[PDB]
């Protein structure tokens, strides 16, 4: 019964949001852009969405009228626009989409591409990492300036990027013998399986309790220090890892001599693991997803790491 | 019981060969290379292979000993190494893998990365596209020079690249109103769903009838002219497309001014659609996959194209 349009449908979190919307029973539309011409994995992803019952809606960010038409078909718009420097960081292209939603006036709610650190709380961040949050703030201001109802989904580290590698930056796999601990390893971080993030997103987008709210993904058992996370892995494997503590000053040593996109990653890591930006404030149960949606049995990080044994 | 190592397991046809091996009941091992540790889609494909019961084998082409250890674990090695200019064209990297197989001596059968035009019939091909056939030929020679037993799988266009788009080079989707027909559109081409390619591959690799043989994938109902292909699509949509015929000379015009990848593609298309290299010769029923494996209900191009409706 709720009609949903996913923008960024073939993206990392986008494709999960699409499937979650189908499973939740939303009538699900996905935007197929003409520019994805010889990108076979995108094309075939769209084919798989259609087989599961999504509806293809052709549109382009170079064709304002195509965007107006698309969002005229649905009640809710979810954007999963890219926002990682080593991938691509086109958060501002959502501005065109805000303007199309504005012109069409039928959208009952818009979920912009957030799913990360809470932007309005990042005002002190260092560039170039800072650009992520500034751009997402700009999109927020366009949404609110336009009076578009919204939900902002924030709060958790994607497990594949922070959990599966024991938060080592070099890789996505657990380390074999040795691991770096950022500081003392006693800063609480929030970790969430991306499938759960998508499930929460599909459940909130028509939850009246979250209209015009920020929704935090902070599943209580998944608030863990890096050392706790590394110890979960030592338990599963039965092998202690040689741990080396990294003081902040040595984490950041010579950052100015590194490629921009890596500086941005280092900056994001610093806010999460050294400042603890994901756990340094309180949120109430009325604005936290696992409490809003307790039927969702989120995947705990011991189960998540097991798939790597 | 037959133990198969797939090299190139996350590639386009490779990932399908992995699943087809599992579905066939082979004990299926997949080479996980260290170099792909930061590519999230490859990493998560390996997790997904693992969940289906595939066995991860760590190895690196830059580590001759890791390869020898890897091939020693299995009865059959299948290589799906990249060989397309606008993606990646590392056919000759297989030579390091042939070396490892020769040294290890336990390997009963090797399927090199073929899966297309029959290299030994392409002596007259257009440079630079010629490279694909010269490099696979060089790999064949190393194989036979080592006395490694082989099966060469050849002879069909991948449906995604030549049928889903009605053979329009620009795209992977059917055109909306107009289509280019190459020549008179009456040259016969072989089309095959890539999942059927993978299935025939899984079935042939332990088949005595194809030891040391070329296996042709030429499913009779899928031997189609381009006009025949286009008429399938017009019958599905019920809309006639506006057709433009393109003479060979205009198709090849100014090719020497094209980017090298597009030079390659243009050349391959020419041999397929203008010279009919996939159907200019006959093959026997004892060397044709659909005849050897009539249990396989191969997908016809009308069923294939329905996905796009
Ligand atoms: N730990 C965490 O909490 C994480 C949070 N994030 C955040 O999640 C959100 C999405 O990130 P992610 O999934 O990695 O994004 P992706 O890199 O996967 O890209 C997502 C989509 O953005 C679309 N896109 C890219 N460029 C353009 C363009 N010029 N014009 C139109 N569309 C474009 C594409 O949509 P299409 O399918 O139509 O081609 C693409 O699929 C971001 O806000 C990111 O900051 C991401 C990683 C970690
Ligand atoms: N119409 C037809 O008949 C078609 C024929 N083909 C043929 O199919 C075969 C496979 O092509 P395709 O699926 O497109 O291949 P891909 O481009 O998808 O690459 C396949 C694998 O090659 C590996 N690879 C690439 N570079 C290297 C490298 N330096 N070192 C080690 N491994 C590397 C990777 O293995 P890993 O997973 O370990 O990273 C990659 O997954 C080719 O011979 C191609 O000519 C392809 C398209 C159409
Ligand atoms: C946790 O909130 C966010 C988290 C990200 C995570 C980004 C995820 O991809 C991460 C990453 C970057 C560089 C790396 O070398 C890396 O190694 C695992 C991971 C990024 C770290 O910023 C991006 C935007 C956010 O709002
Ligand atoms: C059919 O036998 C082969 C076929 C290919 C197909 C290549 C597949 O990727 C194809 C492709 C290239 C450029 C394009 O613009 C394209 O548009 C669909 C398709 C290539 C056409 O040559 C490669 C090697 C072969 O041996």
Author numbering:
A (entry chain E), B (entry chain F): 9 to 317
Publication text:
Here, we present crystal structures of IiPLR1 from Isatis indigotica and pinoresinol reductases (PrRs) AtPrR1 and AtPrR2 from Arabidopsis thaliana, in the apo, substrate-bound and product-bound states. We found that, for all 16 structures we solved, each enzyme adopts a similar head-to-tail dimer conformation, strongly suggesting that each PLR/PrR functions as a homodimer, consistent with the literature that TpPLR1 exists as a dimeric entity in solution. Each structure contains a head-to-tail homodimer, and the catalytic pocket comprises structural elements from both monomers. β4 loop covers the top of the pocket, and residue 98 from the loop governs catalytic specificity.
In contrast to IiPLR1_NAP_ + PIN, the β4 loops of AtPrR1_NAP_ + PIN and AtPrR2_NAP_ + PIN can be clearly identified. These well-defined loops twist as an “8” shape and cover both the NADP+-binding and substrate-binding grooves. Within the twisted loop, His93 and His97 “grasp” helices α5 and α10, while Val92 and Phe94 interact directly with (+)-pinoresinol; Arg95 strongly interacts with NADP+ as well as each of the GXXGXXG motif and α2-helix from neighboring protomer of the dimer. Furthermore, Leu46 (corresponding to Val46 in IiPLR1), His276 and Phe277 of AtPrR1 are positioned similar to the corresponding residues of IiPLR1 to effect substrate binding or product release, except that the β4 loops cover the substrate/product, which are disordered in the IiPLR1 structures. Importantly, the PrRs have more strict requirements for the binding and orientation of lariciresinol compared with PLRs, so PrRs cannot efficiently carry out the third step.
